[PDB]
Amino acid sequence: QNPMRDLKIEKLVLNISVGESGDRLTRASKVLEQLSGQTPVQSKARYTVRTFGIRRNEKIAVHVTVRGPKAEEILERGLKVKEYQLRDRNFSATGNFGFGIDEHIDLGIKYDPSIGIFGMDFYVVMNRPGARVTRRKRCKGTVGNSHKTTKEDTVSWFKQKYDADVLDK
Amino acid sequence: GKSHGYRSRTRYMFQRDFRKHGAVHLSTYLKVYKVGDIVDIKANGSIQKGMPHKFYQGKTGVVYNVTKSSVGVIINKMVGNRYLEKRLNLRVEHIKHSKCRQEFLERVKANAAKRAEAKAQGVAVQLKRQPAQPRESRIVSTEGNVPQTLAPVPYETFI
Amino acid sequence: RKVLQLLRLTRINSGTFVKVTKATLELLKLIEPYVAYGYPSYSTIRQLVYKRGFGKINKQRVPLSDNAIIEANLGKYGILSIDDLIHEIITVGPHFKQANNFLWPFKLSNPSGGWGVPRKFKHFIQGGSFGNREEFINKLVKSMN
Amino acid sequence: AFQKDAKSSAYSSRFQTPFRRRREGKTDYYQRKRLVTQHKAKYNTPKYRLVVRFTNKDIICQIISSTITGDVVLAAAYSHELPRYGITHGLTNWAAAYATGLLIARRTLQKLGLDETYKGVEEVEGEYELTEAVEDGPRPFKVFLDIGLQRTTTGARVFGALKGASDGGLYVPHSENRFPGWDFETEEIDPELLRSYIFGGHVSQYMEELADDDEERFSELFKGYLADDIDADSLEDIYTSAHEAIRADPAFKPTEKKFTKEQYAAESKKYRQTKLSKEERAARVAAKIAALAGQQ
Amino acid sequence: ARRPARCYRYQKNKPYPKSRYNRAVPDSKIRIYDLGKKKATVDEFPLCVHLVSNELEQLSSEALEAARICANKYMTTVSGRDAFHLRVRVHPFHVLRINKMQQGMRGAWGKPHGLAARVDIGQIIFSVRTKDSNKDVVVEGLRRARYKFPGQQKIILSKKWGFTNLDRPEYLKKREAGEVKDDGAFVKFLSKKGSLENNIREFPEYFAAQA
RNA sequence: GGUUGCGGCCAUAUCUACCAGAAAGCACCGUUUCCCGUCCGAUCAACUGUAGUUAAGCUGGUAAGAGCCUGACCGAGUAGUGUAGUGGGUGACCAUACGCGAAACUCAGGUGCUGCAAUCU
RNA sequence: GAGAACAGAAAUCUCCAGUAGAACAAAAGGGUAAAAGCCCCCUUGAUUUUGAUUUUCAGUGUGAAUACAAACCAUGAAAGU
RNA sequence: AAGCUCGUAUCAGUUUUAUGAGGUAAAGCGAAUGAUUAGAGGUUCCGGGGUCGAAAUGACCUUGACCUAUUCUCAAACUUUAAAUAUGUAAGAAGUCCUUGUUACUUAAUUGAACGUGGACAUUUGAAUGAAGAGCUUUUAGUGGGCCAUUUUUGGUAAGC
Numbered sequence A: 001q002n003p004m005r006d007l008k009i010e011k012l013v014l015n016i017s018v019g020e021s022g023d024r025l026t027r028a029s030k031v032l033e034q035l036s037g038q039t040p041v042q043s044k045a046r047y048t049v050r051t052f053g054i055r056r057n058e059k060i061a062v063h064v065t066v067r068g069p070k071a072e073e074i075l076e077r078g079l080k081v082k083e084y085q086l087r088d089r090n091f092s093a094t095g096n097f098g099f100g101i102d103e104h105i106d107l108g109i110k111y112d113p114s115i116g117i118f119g120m121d122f123y124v125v126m127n128r129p130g131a132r133v134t135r136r137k138r139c140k141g142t143v144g145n146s147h148k149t150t151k152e153d154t155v156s157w158f159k160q161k162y163d164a165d166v167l168d169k
Numbered sequence B: 001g002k003s004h005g006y007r008s009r010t011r012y013m014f015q016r017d018f019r020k021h022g023a024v025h026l027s028t029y030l031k032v033y034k035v036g037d038i039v040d041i042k043a044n045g046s047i048q049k050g051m052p053h054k055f056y057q058g059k060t061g062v063v064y065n066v067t068k069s070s071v072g073v074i075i076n077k078m079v080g081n082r083y084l085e086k087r088l089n090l091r092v093e094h095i096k097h098s099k100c101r102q103e104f105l106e107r108v109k110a111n112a113a114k115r116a117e118a119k120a121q122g123v124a125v126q127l128k129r130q131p132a133q134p135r136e137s138r139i140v141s142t143e144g145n146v147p148q149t150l151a152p153v154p155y156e157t158f159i
Numbered sequence C: 001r002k003v004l005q006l007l008r009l010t011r012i013n014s015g016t017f018v019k020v021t022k023a024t025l026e027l028l029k030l031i032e033p034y035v036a037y038g039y040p041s042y043s044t045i046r047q048l049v050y051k052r053g054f055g056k057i058n059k060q061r062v063p064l065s066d067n068a069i070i071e072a073n074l075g076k077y078g079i080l081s082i083d084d085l086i087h088e089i090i091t092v093g094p095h096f097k098q099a100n101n102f103l104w105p106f107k108l109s110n111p112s113g114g115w116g117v118p119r120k121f122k123h124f125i126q127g128g129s130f131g132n133r134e135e136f137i138n139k140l141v142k143s144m145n
Numbered sequence D: 001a002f003q004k005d006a007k008s009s010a011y012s013s014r015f016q017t018p019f020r021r022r023r024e025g026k027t028d029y030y031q032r033k034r035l036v037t038q039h040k041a042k043y044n045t046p047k048y049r050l051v052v053r054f055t056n057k058d059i060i061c062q063i064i065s066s067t068i069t070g071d072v073v074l075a076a077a078y079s080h081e082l083p084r085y086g087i088t089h090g091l092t093n094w095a096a097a098y099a100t101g102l103l104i105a106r107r108t109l110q111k112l113g114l115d116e117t118y119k120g121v122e123e124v125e126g127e128y129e130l131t132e133a134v135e136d137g138p139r140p141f142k143v144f145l146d147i148g149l150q151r152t153t154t155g156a157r158v159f160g161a162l163k164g165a166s167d168g169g170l171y172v173p174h175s176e177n178r179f180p181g182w183d184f185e186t187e188e189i190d191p192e193l194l195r196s197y198i199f200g201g202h203v204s205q206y207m208e209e210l211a212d213d214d215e216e217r218f219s220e221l222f223k224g225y226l227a228d229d230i231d232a233d234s235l236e237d238i239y240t241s242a243h244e245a246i247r248a249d250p251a252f253k254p255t256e257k258k259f260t261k262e263q264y265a266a267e268s269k270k271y272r273q274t275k276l277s278k279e280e281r282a283a284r285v286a287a288k289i290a291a292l293a294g295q296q
Numbered sequence E: 001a002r003r004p005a006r007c008y009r010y011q012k013n014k015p016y017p018k019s020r021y022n023r024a025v026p027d028s029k030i031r032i033y034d035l036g037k038k039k040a041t042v043d044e045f046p047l048c049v050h051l052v053s054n055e056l057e058q059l060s061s062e063a064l065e066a067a068r069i070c071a072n073k074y075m076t077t078v079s080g081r082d083a084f085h086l087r088v089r090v091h092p093f094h095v096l097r098i099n100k101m102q103q104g105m106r107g108a109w110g111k112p113h114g115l116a117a118r119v120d121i122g123q124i125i126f127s128v129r130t131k132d133s134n135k136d137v138v139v140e141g142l143r144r145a146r147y148k149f150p151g152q153q154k155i156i157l158s159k160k161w162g163f164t165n166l167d168r169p170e171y172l173k174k175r176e177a178g179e180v181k182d183d184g185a186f187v188k189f190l191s192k193k194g195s196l197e198n199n200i201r202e203f204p205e206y207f208a209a210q211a
Numbered sequence F: 001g002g003u004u005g006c007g008g009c010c011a012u013a014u015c016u017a018c019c020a021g022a023a024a025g026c027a028c029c030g031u032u033u034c035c036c037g038u039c040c041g042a043u044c045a046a047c048u049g050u051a052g053u054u055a056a057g058c059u060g061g062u063a064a065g066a067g068c069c070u071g072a073c074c075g076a077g078u079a080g081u082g083u084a085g086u087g088g089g090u091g092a093c094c095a096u097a098c099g100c101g102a103a104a105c106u107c108a109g110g111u112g113c114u115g116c117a118a119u120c121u
Numbered sequence G: 001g002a003g004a005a006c007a008g009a010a011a012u013c014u015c016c017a018g019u020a021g022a023a024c025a026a027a028a029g030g031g032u033a034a035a036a037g038c039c040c041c042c043u044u045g046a047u048u049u050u051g052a053u054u055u056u057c058a059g060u061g062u063g064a065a066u067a068c069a070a071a072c073c074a075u076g077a078a079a080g081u
Numbered sequence H: 001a002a003g004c005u006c007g008u009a010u011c012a013g014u015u016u017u018a019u020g021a022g023g024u025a026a027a028g029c030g031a032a033u034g035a036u037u038a039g040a041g042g043u044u045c046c047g048g049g050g051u052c053g054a055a056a057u058g059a060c061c062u063u064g065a066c067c068u069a070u071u072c073u074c075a076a077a078c079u080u081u082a083a084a085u086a087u088g089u090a091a092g093a094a095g096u097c098c099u100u101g102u103u104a105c106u107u108a109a110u111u112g113a114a115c116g117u118g119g120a121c122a123u124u125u126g127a128a129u130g131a132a133g134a135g136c137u138u139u140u141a142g143u144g145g146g147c148c149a150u151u152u153u154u155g156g157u158a159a160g161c
């Protein structure tokens, strides 16, 4: 049965993993700022790889979480680049989905050689209403099965609105 | 070299009881203590401050002091051929009221009763406790119960 | 040892009466290897008191032999004859404590027959002499009295 | 759940469940321990907490103390009571919270005797001040805020409750730095702002400010203010009188009730499923193996 | 350079396992403990004969091993390698020490010297299962192994069905019923406790109570 | 009887799957002027109680369910142990005598009790 | 575990599960989950006075510790610590 | 050794009763940690091998690892359970109950806390057994190589070690 166990988008989170800090990063940052309206967060390396050329606590990436109408634009604007075709992976078992696109230019946003060109990770996480249960401070419960976001239901959801393709087996 | 620090040898003793770790339930702190109260002593390993030393574990003493977060218990420790008086500053999480006197008090309150309840009738009391007496004569019946006759059994192996 | 003392059995072959309760039952339990006991008859309680019965009077261990001695120290509790004594013991009277502590421990000679048995310090039930031997206590004591 | 997840014999067996009031996500015991316990040389002295809690729009203030058999309400007041004293709208806002604290304070102080002595500030300019003990006379009734799981933010309305219980006469020890109008960047209160929130100047200002920039929204929320003809301005007088009403008779009225205890009982057993007997469960299994097993 | 077994026959010390605390200890000379047709089913081998200790002592790993080879050797060449299932029922977990040898008795703590199983009275050492029609052949196996062991051990015919926990009829009653189901080399029994549902899945040939 | 706030003992309250929940209450839920917090009004803050919903929370019921709790001459007077002997045995060890006495096992029964305050067909 | 450009066994992002299987300088053992662990905010109580007490014990000393009294402070909405 | 103050008093290498403490023995391992034998059933876009192959996030065999339910065996420095023997305290006149003073501590509070004044109840007055009595003080010798037996027990192949 269904009233308001609909299927909103929780948040959209973009990711630019750049194996280094400094200019090449803060330029990657600028990309997420002028693309999100919000100011982005930076991630430090967690340990050290040397084949990846990275030190613990370096700053090594940037990313931003975007919720509400703002999400939908960026989602579609990039779903454009993907030509509305994803794959039967991408969709997690827990009901979210994500994709990658190189060259952020392919979604509005001009060029400017002072910035360069970067790739992006798109990760849409979905949920129904009443997710607050799992997230408030007090009486923090969990969501009943008949209300947890599943893979099946999201691919469906994705197929309906957007009218994009799922592809593969 | 040998080792003989304060909490030495206490591995299991200050350990915490299976599936009973964590916060101490609040009744431990709602309990109230007066001078003269008899307490039993048991260290709560979760509470490092105000801890009794191991020797006083499982010991019963008398409160002689009541402070903000503690009671002062006095135990008779026997060192040598003699007892000395020892005074313990214990936090309330390591102390509980003894029931070692509950049967006495229950006995007395009740001895006051049947003492009046007898006098005000016509004396005849008897209120010292007596030990288990041997049992008395009696007649066991066979009606519905003839003796079953057992013998000892052969030796067998099953294995 | 401590118990052997509390029962006033402090030298060999001496004997006393004990009133059975849980709280003395255990005492006997604790000293079985060192004693022989059982249930005495009217006959042997009588001949214990008539022949080897001494009272404790300001200590001193005074021989019975006249009823005035008992009345003197035990009359307080009824009891004014050697037979009034014997009665209190055998019937475990309400003043058995006083009645029985008044008697010095009996001092028996070794058995005249002998011990039955070749080795004493095993249980009666294993062919030895110690433990509860119930009514067979009278045969022994009578040989020792 | 998922197959490769799920729990084992071993896991569940060694599992130490939390308390309950913690499983329930209701009680923070770390705070409770430190709220409740008493100085051991003060013996049977109760340690009363002012318990303030916010339902999805009711305000609960109970003065509560502790017993090992379970806690104890000296007195309660709920902000749904406010209609009795001239408040019908927005009973979850800051000023409702003040009012109810004011209710709770007067009410117990009333039933305690310290009623006529200890009035606390009747005036109310939102000055910072806790009630001072009377020279030769009973020390005031002392009580400690039980925020509960509320976050302490400056401006939070749980401190609203506090302000009126403190203005009401209670001794409820507190600092001024979480009341609305506390200067972040100077250790200093603006009192005009706190008088505003006590009287609901922030709500009324929203009302006035929407009555010419947007009546689409102003009609949706603030609907009831229309339907009872109460445009902004009047809002402070509503509360200025609510203060009068409350002090002039706080003594609590129970609900008139209708339908006895007995009745509520029976009509709710109708919807109460009851357990099953093992003889019944046997018959459900044996039936299940008649069916599921015996080759259809 | 191995000391005579004599030096370690009795259980004089407390269990000295290989541990974080021990560590540098040699391998156990006996390393296989199930030989013969061990893949075989419970139904295959009804008869079961045991080698059984009559002593509280210590069996070396080396004598465990030697014995193991003796009985398996005999049992196969007289009745074939698929005839029987031999289970060494005893693992040598206790490390024996040695004071190898400026000094003399000053600080004398042994280094690991070898392993030994510590064994009770009544404790089974070997177990064998076969076809009834092999009894003699099996018993001769265990009789010869005996010569490899300190202390007296005695061979005892089981009442049980193979390595099963059930005497011969009670297993039969349970089997010619529905309750039993074949596993690797052992077997599984239908429980009356637990989920009716996946209890019915397993053991289909129960739930008629007949054949 | 339900529910809520505060609880006490802290699994007979937990876990897994499914179903049912009147009324009130809780809840989810709407908003961003104001105090306040964020990469993000998701959390946290405030405002509305108006615009919506029992889907989730919550409560209850089902299950030869997992776990957990209780009981029993179920196992077992078994293991182990205090005491005794110029007891057996080459030893290793083992019987016996007066006492104390488990754990696993197996079978049955059970699945939160309850204190203060307010509310409720 | 399941998901996301370059990106791979290992970079960064998300969600589910998670009784602690981690972390708490150090040996090890106790102990700890809205914490005792991780992130942040504010700090000097690591302070002043002189007694009592527990361990080791001679019931000496020393080390270390515990509960108070008299100060002055820190923090927190507060109970407190 | 010298005594001294008292004396049915108070005392105890003992039991009983009531109430605690404990993690050894045993036990356990289809309970945690750590060891250990065996198969059986699963799962890989994924450790490698091999056939088909242009490949495949291809299929099929395969051997490994993991998973599930089983199986044989273990722990001084493992453990849910958990003895016996040992072990703390209590069994009244220094007790139990009523009335209602003192204070600067403490409570919202003559509230509490401590110490009391006045009043009520005697030896079945509060288990056993014993007691050639109990308590207390001073001063001083010798000693400060120990060895043995049963049981528990460490090192050692062992020892009259």
Ligand SMILES: [Mg+2]
Pocket (backbone or CB within 6 Å): A002, A003, A004, A005, F053, F054, F055
């Ligand atoms: Mg709905």
Ligand SMILES: [Mg+2]
Pocket (backbone or CB within 6 Å): A018, A019, A020, A052, A053
């Ligand atoms: Mg790089």
Ligand SMILES: [Mg+2]
Pocket (backbone or CB within 6 Å): B001, B002, B003
């Ligand atoms: Mg050491």
Ligand SMILES: [Mg+2]
Pocket (backbone or CB within 6 Å): B021, B022, D016, D018
């Ligand atoms: Mg916990």
Ligand SMILES: [Mg+2]
Pocket (backbone or CB within 6 Å): none
């Ligand atoms: Mg400290």
Ligand SMILES: [Mg+2]
Pocket (backbone or CB within 6 Å): C006, C007, C008, C016, C017, C018
């Ligand atoms: Mg006597």
Ligand SMILES: [Mg+2]
Pocket (backbone or CB within 6 Å): C112, C113, C143
């Ligand atoms: Mg003769």
Ligand SMILES: [Mg+2]
Pocket (backbone or CB within 6 Å): none
């Ligand atoms: Mg002769």
Ligand SMILES: [Mg+2]
Pocket (backbone or CB within 6 Å): none
């Ligand atoms: Mg003759």
Ligand SMILES: [Mg+2]
Pocket (backbone or CB within 6 Å): C118
């Ligand atoms: Mg002879």
Ligand SMILES: [Mg+2]
Pocket (backbone or CB within 6 Å): C109, C112, C143, C144, C145
């Ligand atoms: Mg003669």
Ligand SMILES: [Mg+2]
Pocket (backbone or CB within 6 Å): D004, D005, D006
């Ligand atoms: Mg698992």
Ligand SMILES: [Mg+2]
Pocket (backbone or CB within 6 Å): D009
């Ligand atoms: Mg199981």
Ligand SMILES: [Mg+2]
Pocket (backbone or CB within 6 Å): D031
């Ligand atoms: Mg807090």
Ligand SMILES: [Mg+2]
Pocket (backbone or CB within 6 Å): none
């Ligand atoms: Mg031995």
Ligand SMILES: [Mg+2]
Pocket (backbone or CB within 6 Å): E012, E013
């Ligand atoms: Mg040894």
